[PDB]
DNA sequence: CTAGATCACATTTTAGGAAAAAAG
DNA sequence: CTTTTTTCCTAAAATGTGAT
DNA sequence: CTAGATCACATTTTAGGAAAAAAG
DNA sequence: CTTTTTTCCTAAAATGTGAT
């Protein structure tokens with residue numbers, strides 16, 4: 063049982079987003095705060111040419127679109143797209159601020175999540191500056207075995223992801239992610255057959 | 266006049282840090298929150314070999330070491346080093362939390378700054394994934410002309426920085442930053458003589 | 469060690485479908501279960517997404533999960 | 543436009559040192575000042591770090607700053 | 617080999633798998649190990665999970681599919 | 690040229706710069722424009738800011754340093 | 763295919779503080 | 787007189803070099 | 807020097823939903 | 831009977847290829 067979250071939700075509008083739909087468009091005005099009741103989303107950004115880059119996955123429990131809530135007239139900083147199908151609690155910034163002034167605990171929980179994201183994103187920066195592609199991919203396979211939807215498997219953690227996607231995570235071409243997944247297999251570090259990958263030695 | 270910040274400071278221990286000294290060591294326990302009353306610091310991270318990478322500059326007004334404040338027994342996520350000489354307000358997490366429960370406004374101000382940093386750092390990720398070195402450097406010269414200590418100059422904004430440092434910002438070698446600063450000069454985009462660089466067309 | 473990991477699987481109050489699969493796979497004690505991996509269980513006959521999900525959900529409500537790593541067993 | 547940018551530089555109450563530099567550089571109105579750039583001012587004789595800093599600080603306390611970009615001047 | 621002459625039932629398969637073999641005329645374990653994997657998948661009512669159960673019950677008993685035998689029967 | 694024969698004072702320099710020239714025997718603007726930049730910096734009591742003031746007051750009047758003249762005086 | 767990293771060391775450029783000159 | 791500017795100095799840090 | 811990107815298209819692999827088989 | 835598992839299907843998405 064969780065008193066604060068239950069109270070928070072009771073002041074939200076719940077809305078279902080179909081798989082692959084866009085919850086947030088970069089550039090749009092920011093006036094609403096979201097909270098993922100069920101599902102998982104992908105936070106992504108794009109270059110001028112249109113190339114994609116996955117900033118982060120968020121899951122049940124995570125807030126979304128919180129960044130526009132502190133300064134007036136800010137714009138959504140990234141696309142947010144439903145990975146699976148999502149059920150999302152919604153509340154206007156204006157009305158959320160009113161909750162805060164009733165019980166600052168909810169703001170604590172939001173800031174907790176922000177702090178985490180900053181640590182995680184900062185690390186992503188280090189990864190890009192310091193590691194070659196093999197290093198970033200290896201790192202990402204370990205981070206993907208951490209996610210909720212990862213399945214336990216005898217040899218280590220089993221995950222479902224495409225080579226193309228991994229490419230959009232570590233910032234490189236899909237052809238390259240393919241070559242490297244094939245090398246990490248000779249080195250008996252992982253087992254790759256289809257979208258199915260067993261990351262040896264987790265769990 | 267600012268009532269909240271004044272009240273906050275009156276519950277802090279003020280401490281002077283000499284230029285080039287370390288305020289925060291990555292890995293250390295996190296139990297204290299800092300606030301820069303005067304000066305400027307550099308937030309940096311390192312790879313195993315010891316190579317440096319400047320995550321961000323923080324200035325007067327900015328909080329530091331806030332990330333350990335939401336979960337218990339967390340570790341400093343990065344080195345923080347005094348760029349100039351700094352005067353820093355200090356308060357234990359424990360005692361800061363007590364302030365929050367007296368006036369949540371201070372927590373708002375802290376979260377505001379977090380949100381900003383997340384947006385800024387996320388962008389740094391995009392820069393690394395999308396731009397070549399010339400693009401990242403050009404971008405960084407524009408962002409450095411935004412800083413407080415940048416001097417106004419007739420042709421555009423004037424800044425003081427070394428090639429080595431720029432390298433640690435955009436994540437590349439110093440030799441390379443030198444070559445590119447020399448190209449951006451033929452293209453009449455900037456004027457570079459010594460640590461002194463005039464970024465044409467700002468202001 | 470732990471006290472709950474030695475109780476029979478029945479103390480979980482599963483469905484007839486799930487109960488019959490475990491007992492034909494030789495899983496008698498909750499301790500045997502938590503050690504089994506998710507991918508491993510899905511292969512067991514008559515156990516599909518809904519049963520697998522019921523099991524992961526009844527364990528979660530009781531602190532536990534699958535693929536747990538135990539020592540001194542039995 | 544703005545009302546304060548047309549008052550003489552004296553309404554800023556500067557030090558004798560700063561006042562004498564502006565008046566020998568032909569800066570009579572606050573509007574002339576805010577247009578001047580920081581690097582440009584530092585070259586002016588008898589004006590060093592402390593005076594330059596006093597000026598940037600007296601303008602800041604009054605909303606303004608240096609290197610401001612104005613239209614229709616005078 | 618001695619085990620290759622026992623009926624398929626000695627493998628203790630599921631009802632689903634058992635019914636497919638008996639409608640494909642596979643009575644003895646020796647007939648099975650000779651059948652190829654691609655060949656079996658075409659047999660009606662036999663899908664990934666049953667095919668996998670069979671390859672797994674044979675593996676636990678030394679054997680596998682697509683084995684090449686002499687003097688049969 | 691007509692301007693190169695006027696005294697250095699017609700440039701309206703600072704007291705600091707004026708005193709350095711008059712102790713280096715530079716009376717006429719013509720003597721100045723002939724002097725080289727590296728040469729001037731060595732002269733006592735003349736540093737970056739004065740050297741810069743001089744190069745800037747000459748530039749606003751067409752001239753510069755290290756100019757090469759004939760028939761002098 | 764190309765963008766960048768790489769190597770050691772002679773040379774250039776900076777920080778910043780005492781002390782002198784000039785202004786207040 | 788005092789205070790601010792400006793000179794003037796060197797250890798140490800920063801830099802370019804250019805073929806692979 | 808090397809790590810990666812690059813190109814188009816024949817081939818492989820997946821998602822997910824109707825429908826059949828089997829268990830409850 | 832009802833519910834869950836498992837088969838079985840194809841448009842569409844994902845993939846490898848390898849010299850420069």
Ligand SMILES: Nc1ncnc2c1ncn2[C@@H]1O[C@@H]2COP(=O)(O)O[C@H]2[C@H]1O
Pocket residue numbers: 086092105117118125126127128129130131137138139140141142179183383384387
């Ligand atoms: N680096 C990041 N990590 C996790 N989530 C992010 C990151 N950047 C942006 N987001 C989320 O994406 C959202 C886009 O809209 P907002 O700016 O309102 O709020 C943003 C965050 O909720």
Ligand SMILES: Nc1ncnc2c1ncn2[C@@H]1O[C@@H]2COP(=O)(O)O[C@H]2[C@H]1O
Pocket residue numbers: 180181184289295308320321328329330331332333334340341342343344345382386
């Ligand atoms: N990406 C970032 N941008 C700005 N500041 C940061 C970033 N990452 C870490 N920091 C600061 O560096 C601090 C290191 O200690 P903390 O983890 O306590 O808190 C951290 C932040 O205050």
